[PDB]
């Protein structure tokens, strides 16, 4: 409300373009690095197997976090926190 000029932008395919390795890297610092089951599966992988899905129609992209699941918005915010920080830092200098 304090501004005189207004601009609007949109992101194309926001949920479909979230890289899975980015999600894994974002969630790694908050999960202990250890083997949950013997010496075959890790705790981080076991937790992350409950949020991804191998889409039959999008087999080219591999497995992605699909829209309609309960945990998708929180993961999206956590992943995009870095980009939000970068954009906010850029916009602060321009006022």
């Amino acid at each position: 409300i304090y501004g005189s000029s207004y601009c609007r932008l949109d992101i194309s395919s926001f949920f479909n373009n979230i890289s899975f390795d980015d999600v894994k890297q974002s969630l790694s610092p908050y999960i202990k690095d250890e083997y949950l089951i013997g010496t075959e599966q890790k705790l981080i992988d076991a937790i992350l197997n409950s949020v991804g899905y191998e889409s039959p129609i999008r087999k080219d992209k591999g497995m992605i976090i699909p829209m309609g699941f309960r945990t998708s918005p929180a993961i999206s915010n956590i992943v995009f926190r870095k980009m939000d920080l970068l954009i906010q830092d850029f916009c602060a200098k321009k006022g």
């Binding site: 304090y2 926190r81 920080l85 906010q88 830092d89 602060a92 200098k93 006022g95």
Partner: protein
């Protein structure tokens, strides 16, 4: 005249907004760090307004990159002054070109006329942004605007804990900036000539002396402020609490003829002061405030309609708050800071305006003390105060001692309105079940009080959509409405209930009304004090009272005891002997061994007689409890007392038996039988001492107290759990 202050992501603030300022804004709370942070934010903003090099503030979290401070100024009076055709001056035109020029040239010929010239209020918004790299940016890139805003809305800060009485810099700053005189028209030469003429033996001596002095002391020339200060000092005839009073009085007086509205902050106005001194300070401030008020019929010279400046107080004294509430009234507000769950400062408004004149006139220190609390327990009678303020009982529970208990009626509760400051000061209202349901003997039907109807109406919520879990409340409300008749049956001639127990209904209504911060006890305080599990302790207390308080009236105990034993029968005439021998006295003399043995034997015989009569006349052992809790001004089961039963003319035999017991044997207990006598404290202390002697561990004695007294211990435990849940937030 600031209207809004907003702080985002700085120090201990996430998003804090302060608005609706009054003249006598007062700040209280437990979190002093929040007040210090607010003061630092204001000082930083006003230092950056005047282009001073200061360290930027810190961030609450590092996952952001900006920190914003927003200020809104009400530029309404200045606009009216400048835009008038009567005022033609340099300063007015400069102010218009600086403030109202840019925003007015972008409007058409329709919005300017009849749309912004009738009653509108003009606002000016200034934003300061701090970046991650310690960079400072403004929303308006014009130093002239900032300078004009700083010189039109000055900020003054007063600290009373560390104040030097030998420094009068704030006084001179206020005097120099609140004058309407141009001091540049006073030529130095003519004043020097006048002084020389006034004092001289030979013409020119003073001028030569001044020239010789100046030729040696040649330094930088006087500034304008120094010259005006010197002129004021030569004009006037002379130069902790007194300093603050002088500052406030000067600020009020000098601003009546100027369009500059300062903002003042004062920290700890009552440090090292008598309560009467603080009350007198507030009273004098109010009198000076009311002296210069021109409202309605009050007119004439010396009375103005100029708005008053804004004053903020940081105090920890209930006396100042009480005086401010009583005197100023609608021109003041109370702020409460507190914290959050994760840790962050809040700002809330506490209600301080009352529509009842009696409440304002009867306002005392307890009402002010209610402000400085973290958990308030509201009760109706005076026995609840005697029960909940017992020192021995609170010794074992170091969590209910942090709550304050207050006696409030319906009108007092309405005036206080605890629901407004619900998030800042949690509270619980404890009442009895008689306030909701009334029972009758002649007509076999319950009835609902207007308070119950109001609660049902408040719980009922029309204009709503479906929500899972809300239909149960509607079903409970429907059951409460339909239980209006509730035909039942009373046994023992309208004394007990067939099978109701008043417990399931009480539990259900408590579950329903928990959302409204209410708790309805099944029975009264005396009912909870003496129950079926407390008969041995009550009997032991009565026996101890008989053993201790009863003494021989005659100065010679042996002769009187022998005469009364040889005159009255020891077994059949024991009651007349006890009545005519032992009396209640404050002092307990020590008798001989034989006299002590005889007195002990007589007391044991009296105890045996009373216990045998008690266990013989009554059999079910429940009528004993009923009679005990009814003789001590109480009601049970049917909600009936002595006076109510006598007016209803029911249970003649029970009343006659109680009267016989009172007027025949328990004549000594009668003074400790009226309301507000002091038996509660004595009984509680005796019971706690006995249990402490029997059981050493704290857990064991607490468990035994819970077993003996279920209801009050449950209330204390619930209050303690509520306090522990919110302990982190409401603690500095």
């Amino acid at each position: 005249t600031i209207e809004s202050i907003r702080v985002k992501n700085l120090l201990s603030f996430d998003d804090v907004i302060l608005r609706d300022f009054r003249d006598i804004n007062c700040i209280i709370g437990r979190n002093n760090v929040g007040k210090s942070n607010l003061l630092k934010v204001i000082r930083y903003f006003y230092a950056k307004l005047e282009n001073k090099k200061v360290i930027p503030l810190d961030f609450h979290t590092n996952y952001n990159a900006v920190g914003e401070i927003t200020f809104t100024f009400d530029t309404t009076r200045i606009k009216k002054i400048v835009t008038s055709r009567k005022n033609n001056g340099r300063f007015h035109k400069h102010i218009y070109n600086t403030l109202f020029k840019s925003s007015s040239v972008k409007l058409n010929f329709e919005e300017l006329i009849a749309r912004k010239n009738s009653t509108n209020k003009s606002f000016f918004s200034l934003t300061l942004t701090i970046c991650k790299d310690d960079s400072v940016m403004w929303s308006v890139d014009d130093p002239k605007v900032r300078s004009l805003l700083a010189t039109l809305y000055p900020f003054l800060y007063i600290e009373t804990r560390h104040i030097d009485l030998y420094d009068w810099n704030p006084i001179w700053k206020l005097i120099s900036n609140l004058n309407s005189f141009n001091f540049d028209d006073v030529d130095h030469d003519e004043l020097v000539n006048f002084l020389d003429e006034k004092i001289s033996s030979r013409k020119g001596d003073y001028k030569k002396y001044i020239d010789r002095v100046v030729s040696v002391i040649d330094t930088k020339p006087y500034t304008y402020k120094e010259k005006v200060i010197n002129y004021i000092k030569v004009a006037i005839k002379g130069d902790s609490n007194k300093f603050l009073e002088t500052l406030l009085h000067l600020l009020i007086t000098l601003t009546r003829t100027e369009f500059i509205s300062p903002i003042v902050y004062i920290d700890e106005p009552e440090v090292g002061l008598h309560p009467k001194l603080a009350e007198s300070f507030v009273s004098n401030l109010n009198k000076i405030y009311s002296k210069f008020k021109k409202t309605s019929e009050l007119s004439g010279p010396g009375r103005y309609k100029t708005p008053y400046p804004n004053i903020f107080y940081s105090t920890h004294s209930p006396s100042i708050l009480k005086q401010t509430i009583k005197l100023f009234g609608k021109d003041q507000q109370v702020l409460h800071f507190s914290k959050k769950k994760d840790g962050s400062t809040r700002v809330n408004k506490i209600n301080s305006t009352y529509s009842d004149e009696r409440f304002l006139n009867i306002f005392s220190d307890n009402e002010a003390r209610l402000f400085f609390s973290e958990y308030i327990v509201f009760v109706e009678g005076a026995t609840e105060l005697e029960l909940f303020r017992n020192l021995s009982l609170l010794n074992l529970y170091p969590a209910f001692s942090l709550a304050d208990i207050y006696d409030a009626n319906e009108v007092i509760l309405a005036n206080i309105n605890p629901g407004y400051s619900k998030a800042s000061i949690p509270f619980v209202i404890i009442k009895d079940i008689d306030t909701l349901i009334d029972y009758s003997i002649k007509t076999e039907k319950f009835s609902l009080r207007p308070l119950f109807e109001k609660m049902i109406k408040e719980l009922t919520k029309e204009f709503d959509y479906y929500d899972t879990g809300f239909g149960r409340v509607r079903k409970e409300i429907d059951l409460f409405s339909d239980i209006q008749s509730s035909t039942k049956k009373h046994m023992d001639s309208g004394l007990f209930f067939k099978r109701f127990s008043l417990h399931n209904l009480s539990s259900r209504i408590n579950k329903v009304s928990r959302k409204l911060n209410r708790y309805f006890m099944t029975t009264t305080i005396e009912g909870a004090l003496i129950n079926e599990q407390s008969l041995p302790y009550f009997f032991n207390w009565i026996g101890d009272v008989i053993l201790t308080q009863m003494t021989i009236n005659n100065p010679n105990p042996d002769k009187f005891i022998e005469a009364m034993r040889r005159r009255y029968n020891i077994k059949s005439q024991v009651v007349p002997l006890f009545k005519s021998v032992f009396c209640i006295g404050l002092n307990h003399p020590v008798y001989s061994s034989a006299v002590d043995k005889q007195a002990l034997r007589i007391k044991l015989s009296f105890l045996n007689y009373l216990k045998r009569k008690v266990y013989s006349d009554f059999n079910n052992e429940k009528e004993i409890v009923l009679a005990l809790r009814l003789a001590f001004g109480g009601k049970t089961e049917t909600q009936y007392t002595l006076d109510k039963l006598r007016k209803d003319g029911e249970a003649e035999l029970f009343r006659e038996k109680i009267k016989n017991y009172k007027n025949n044997e328990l004549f000594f207990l009668e003074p400790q039988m009226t309301k507000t006598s002091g038996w509660v404290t004595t009984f509680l202390n005796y019971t706690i001492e006995k249990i402490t002697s029997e059981e050493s561990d704290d857990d064991r004695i607490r468990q035994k107290l819970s077993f003996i007294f279920p209801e009050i211990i449950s209330i204390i435990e619930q209050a303690s759990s509520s306090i522990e849940a919110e302990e982190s937030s409401l603690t500095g």
